[PDB]
Design a protein around this ligand. Sequence first.
Ligand SMILES: NC(=O)c1ccc[n+]([C@@H]2O[C@H](COP(=O)([O-])OP(=O)(O)OC[C@H]3O[C@@H](n4cnc5c(N)ncnc54)[C@H](OP(=O)(O)O)[C@@H]3O)[C@@H](O)[C@H]2O)c1
Ligand SMILES: NC(=O)c1ccc[n+]([C@@H]2O[C@H](COP(=O)([O-])OP(=O)(O)OC[C@H]3O[C@@H](n4cnc5c(N)ncnc54)[C@H](OP(=O)(O)O)[C@@H]3O)[C@@H](O)[C@H]2O)c1
Ligand SMILES: [Mg+2]
Ligand SMILES: [Mg+2]
Lengths: 411, 412
Amino acid sequence: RKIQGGSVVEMQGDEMTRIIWELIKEKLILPYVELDLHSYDLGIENRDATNDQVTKDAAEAIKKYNVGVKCATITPDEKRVEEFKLKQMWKSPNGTIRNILGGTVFREAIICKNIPRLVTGWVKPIIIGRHAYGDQYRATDFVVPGPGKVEITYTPKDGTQKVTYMVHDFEEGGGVAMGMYNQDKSIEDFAHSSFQMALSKGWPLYLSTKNTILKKYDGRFKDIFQEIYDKKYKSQFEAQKICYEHRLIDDMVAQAMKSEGGFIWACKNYDGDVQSDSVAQGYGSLGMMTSVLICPDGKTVEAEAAHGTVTRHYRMYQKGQETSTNPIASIFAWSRGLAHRAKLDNNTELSFFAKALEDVCIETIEAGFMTKDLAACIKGLPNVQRSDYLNTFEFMDKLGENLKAKLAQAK
Amino acid sequence: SRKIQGGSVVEMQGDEMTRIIWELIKEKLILPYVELDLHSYDLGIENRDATNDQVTKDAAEAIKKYNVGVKCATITPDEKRVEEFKLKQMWKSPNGTIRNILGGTVFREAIICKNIPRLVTGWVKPIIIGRHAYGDQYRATDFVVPGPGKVEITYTPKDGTQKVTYMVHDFEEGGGVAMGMYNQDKSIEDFAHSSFQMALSKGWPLYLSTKNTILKKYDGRFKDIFQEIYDKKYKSQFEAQKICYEHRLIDDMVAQAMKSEGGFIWACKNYDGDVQSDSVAQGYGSLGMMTSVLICPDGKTVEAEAAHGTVTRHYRMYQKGQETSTNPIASIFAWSRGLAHRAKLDNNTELSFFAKALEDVCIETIEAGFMTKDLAACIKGLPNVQRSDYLNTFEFMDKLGENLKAKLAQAK
Ligand SMILES: NC(=O)c1ccc[n+]([C@@H]2O[C@H](COP(=O)([O-])OP(=O)(O)OC[C@H]3O[C@@H](n4cnc5c(N)ncnc54)[C@H](OP(=O)(O)O)[C@@H]3O)[C@@H](O)[C@H]2O)c1
Ligand SMILES: NC(=O)c1ccc[n+]([C@@H]2O[C@H](COP(=O)([O-])OP(=O)(O)OC[C@H]3O[C@@H](n4cnc5c(N)ncnc54)[C@H](OP(=O)(O)O)[C@@H]3O)[C@@H](O)[C@H]2O)c1
Ligand SMILES: [Mg+2]
Ligand SMILES: [Mg+2]
């Protein structure tokens, strides 16, 4: 028989990651697990065909069933509009989903003992907690076509004072302008999730902002974190001999670079996006990073890879050129989603399966079978020969055989 | 005097640890050898408070007049600084004020010593960041939203045509924060030109990072302006020099930079240039080993500075009687880069030599094994550093002064 899995929302994506997603389902998931699978095609063509409604439907399903696993998707700009003959420049599906669900996206490298790092000192993990809501990812931006005034206005619902602020008087020429925002409740949730994560690991917590420049906007993040620390977590931190500190973002990225690792890093939405790619690459590869959205309700999660659709590799695939794209992050999206589904349902056999999936990945790499990005970590990209790595399909096949043998040997 | 006649330089004095080092540089390395027409503006936090920040605006206008400014790091106050100095207001960053007036691109690059290991294994060639100096978060209008209500952003054309209003957010429960920011086409164009010109002058490829998939209009404008200027002015020159230009999304770019061998110009928007220049400095060795020069669009006016701040944490050690070992090199190169530009403008051969000698002394001293604790930790690892591995802040300044005196004496 197969493992009885329960309800999981699956979102299919684009380009190289869509292909890998198909390989993962066929070789690693479907032969072993039967799921009540609620599938949503978030491929760019289906999003366009449905006027992006499929994205909103998917987010609602994640809230209902509490577990989503998402493949990387194209976020279109003008070049993608021309490529796919799109009706609109659709918004990022990740931004739409995260805007609805809220929460914190936690990202962490996937570590193999035989893979050298690019950053010499990082002997312990760095976990980024990326605030998943607002800021640049729900902004209202526009081109200023010529001379004129841009202003921003707040009108309270309760008929107290309305306030209009000058953004800029464009005296010559035009430019660009934007408004963005965040919400107190969302920032509070983000603080709680950061403090709880630090206590769960027994590691210090650092929050980064630029509150010397954005004194009101970023100052609010710093103030809410400090109030929540003092009122809810200071004594527990002191019990575990860990600390909480706010640092300016430019100081903090330098401190991270020279650290030994072993800390939680609470990042605003944009910083979390950018620095999670820097951290993933510092440890090894973007293909070796986990990403999980933990919603404030303590039960809903969305797992994904931190990287995109790997367009550059897909262009090689389209030309029939051999590719070696790392599928591990995509595989860990499935394993982390299934592990959460099993934790919610006390599903012992699914818990075992999800862990075995992750173990097979690490064991395969550490035994010396890997894609080109990891071979380059070991050898250096100049010294990498074709015999040092497997292409994407050979690697998927090797994982498939190693998983089959692990599940067989366990029963 | 028989000193080098150096000409007119605008000096802005600063705060905390860098203020201490700044005075040591002037007394030990500059004033013994160079006579300057020095236009000094005290941008210390107490004097900015006493002048209601007017000293900062006056300094910026002086840089416009004399074309050369050298700036010490300054405190940008938040609420805690208001309390510590009993400030009248939460003053704006002086860097932001000066850059907003001058415009241009801030170019940042590590200062490389052959005996100093990197934290990033692959960076064998230089990475030069060109940070757009104007606008975005550093000229933003931000505010607390005290409760439910609507935030909207409006554009009113100057020529009387129809005003446009866009919703930013309808706050339905609780409050939050909101902000507006902007940038100007002319400033973006100047940023593009300076970036393409730096790439051609160094002979390296150029990369622009944005997040135009998310900020499709705002960041798309940067991407479009760069591409149109590249196509119509620089592409044939790039191809002749066998270099290229590419736009990349910022999160891809930071990973590409991490695994690269170096050897590229990196055009960054104001905020990214701020953050990633600290990441790059640390990756090569230390925040104390990075140059920073604002190059204005007029092709004549520059403001040189260190990329790091006032090093408050070391200043607190100094205040409590604990030995400090703060790296002065970036501050020294602020002087040397400023004086080099002064000399280029004036065709002042002796001053050009002096400015280069100053930089050579710094490198030669560290390579000879005399260095502050940050660089000793690069070599040994911080847990293995012993007091005999490094010099304290004043000892290192003295050693630089001895070596500079000796170099200039031999030169004659
Ligand atoms: N979560 C998401 O849905 C998400 C995230 C980011 C971007 N995107 C979309 O993805 C598309 C491509 O964006 P992008 O090219 O900037 O970013 P990307 O897909 O993350 O790829 C950037 C580069 O990182 C490396 N890389 C990433 N994932 C890898 C993997 N699994 N194995 C090996 N190398 C890997 C490759 O470097 P080399 O070229 O050096 O081999 C690749 O070209 C865009 O349409 C973007 O909107 C979506
Ligand atoms: N250019 C400017 O005017 C400028 C730039 C940035 C910040 N600031 C102001 O500077 C003040 C302090 O900011 P901050 O603490 O975030 O940043 P910072 O002054 O850059 O110092 C951050 C940390 O970087 C290291 N570091 C920086 N410069 C160093 C040097 N020359 N030698 C050795 N180590 C060095 C030290 O790390 P360790 O503690 O690990 O030794 C230091 O504590 C704030 O008031 C801020 O507004 C101004
Ligand atoms: Mg990203
Ligand atoms: Mg900075």
